[PDB]
Design a protein around this ligand. Sequence first.
Ligand SMILES: *Cc1c(COP(=O)(O)O)cnc(C)c1O
Ligand SMILES: *Cc1c(COP(=O)(O)O)cnc(C)c1O
Lengths: 385, 385
Amino acid sequence: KLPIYLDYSATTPVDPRVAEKMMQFMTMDGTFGNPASRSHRFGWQAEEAVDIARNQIADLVGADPREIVFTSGATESDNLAIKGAANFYQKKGKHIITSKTEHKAVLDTCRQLEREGFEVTYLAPQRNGIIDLKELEAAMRDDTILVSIMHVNNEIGVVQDIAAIGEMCRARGIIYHVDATQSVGKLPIDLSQLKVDLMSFSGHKIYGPKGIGALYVRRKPRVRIEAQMHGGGHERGMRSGTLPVHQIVGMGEAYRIAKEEMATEMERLRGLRNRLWNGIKDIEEVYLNGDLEHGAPNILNVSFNYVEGESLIMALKDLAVSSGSAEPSYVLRALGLNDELAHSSIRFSLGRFTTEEEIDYTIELVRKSIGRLRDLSPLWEMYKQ
Amino acid sequence: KLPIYLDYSATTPVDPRVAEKMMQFMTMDGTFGNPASRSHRFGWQAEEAVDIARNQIADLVGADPREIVFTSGATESDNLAIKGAANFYQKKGKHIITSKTEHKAVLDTCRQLEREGFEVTYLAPQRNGIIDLKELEAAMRDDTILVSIMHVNNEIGVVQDIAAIGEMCRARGIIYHVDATQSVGKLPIDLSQLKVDLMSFSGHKIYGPKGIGALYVRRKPRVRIEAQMHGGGHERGMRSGTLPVHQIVGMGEAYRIAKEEMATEMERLRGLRNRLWNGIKDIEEVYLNGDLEHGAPNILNVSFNYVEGESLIMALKDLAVSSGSAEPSYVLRALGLNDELAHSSIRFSLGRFTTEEEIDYTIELVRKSIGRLRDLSPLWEMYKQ
Ligand SMILES: *Cc1c(COP(=O)(O)O)cnc(C)c1O
Ligand SMILES: *Cc1c(COP(=O)(O)O)cnc(C)c1O
């Protein structure tokens, strides 16, 4: 029992196998060396471990290891890719197009670039979170140098057609960046086919450790960015600093694991997700945010009408979930939900350790909770005539 | 025996206690929560651990927890403090003063600011590595907004009078940043007294894990910087991104340990360092780069004259050390050493697990190895008339 964790999108637990691998690269009896120490064995062994992990990450997304730049997380990756490309190609233009539902790491980076003189078009998504590709194309100009649209949304799990957006960008000579923190290891990614130029990844959203991530930077056709972190020109000049070996080994192991169990795990999560939805879609006034069909298999975001969101989370004390509110979720607001519905919205994000028992328990707890509140709810009183 | 590790300045092993604390914040059965998840217990517990570590770090350096900003390492801390303060106060001036012997994270950051329109004065150190404060003083102008001089040099261990430098800066209203990555936990630091406004710290140089660090940002008199990492306004708007709890717990425990054992360990290292130098200082043409009495108690950088540096490292294969070459060390070159002598220089850095047994073995190996090299050395032949 205990507080059931259904907030995997916020962060996931490190896989035991990842944890045990990481432990081998920390203490004095392990490979604790600095890979930058080129004159001795401690460094050589550390460097080898990094290369193995860099290849493991690359294998998952069908990339060349040299295209993988290590960062401290997907936030830095997002900052590096957008600020990096925006600054590098600014002579070609200063227009950037993105989406209003992007993660803050993308939105706040674009806001900073706006104060630096760049122009940013924040596209509004359709009611279901999907970006109208026609509007995207209409927004593109001769001075547009970059587009950033995420693969899977962290709040509602909607999936964008990154392959198609990439096509549109390559044809116009526009750099395309994808924040794939919520899709890597869940949805198939093959950059040998995909026309994406920059792609952000993280470790802790796929059972790896927090504080590590990577940025895919296409080698062919060659894409370039200005490093945002200086001090040695590490990572082929794109990101300076000491390589956190144990963190890097953990991310690699996490990505090796994902490649192998992805197919079976995702089909499993999709089943638990539908199970959850089927068990509550019948509740009087409930709305699903996104698309329980093409969206991510592990995310379920639903709004419960005629209930004070302020007390919803308290009602669901037995569940560790999220509402998105910081002010209500800006993603839900971008979808068109009013402040009240947005507040009384819950995101259920499933993971590797979620079971049917938990789901059925959750289904029950939700129906009952929504039932009680609605009884002693002045708002619901209003609904029923 | 095996390759004796005398490269503690490049990186240190994670202390066993640090490693065991970290392991409790990774897997499903431990505190794996995202501290940013404010609606449930997994988040709350993680937040508590972070706050505990933030205090442990602040206590070592005499700061307030609120002045500690978490970063991915000292490289990022250096980037954040300098780019952050430069951009924030640019309307008051764009002149920055630093030292030619600073770590690359400071130098390459200053180089980037230069192409962005900032003016940087790189002061040359004295023969012994000390910055002549009168020269620093003469370089300060009314439009000088920032100074960055490190506490302990990573290559030669020389110590700068940061207290006096801080006084000079505060009196002129200049922001003073100190890269204290090699001094924290080794030399006493009390920010409640020290007139330093920004200070960089790392974890893996003081037996903590790689990939984690912090930036001290003075609260009173209030100092401010522009964030370089966007996405949520975390760390009081100064550094966005997920807080890597297991990493932060580790740095905290590492700083807790350093506060407790600093006095006893530093005296021990000073003894071993002195033991090493005494055993080789009598070798024909050997020179100590830095200062034997005031320099850091764990770093010994020596040059061996009239000997090809190319064979030096190999000859000392039984030791894991560094020559600081990339091209010879730029620090040594800044001290006035010719390219050849700089190349034939070795940096010995000691730590928590170094023993007198290792030092004595090192002494013998150095003497014998240097004698053998000089036996067949064309350079030595020239010298011997
Ligand atoms: C979590 C997340 C990020 C930020 O990840 P980092 O590793 O945590 O800092 C960025 N984008 C998306 C879509 C995310 O879910
Ligand atoms: C190692 C070091 C740095 C960089 O440290 P990070 O944790 O490794 O990236 C900066 N300054 C000094 C003086 C150092 O010794």
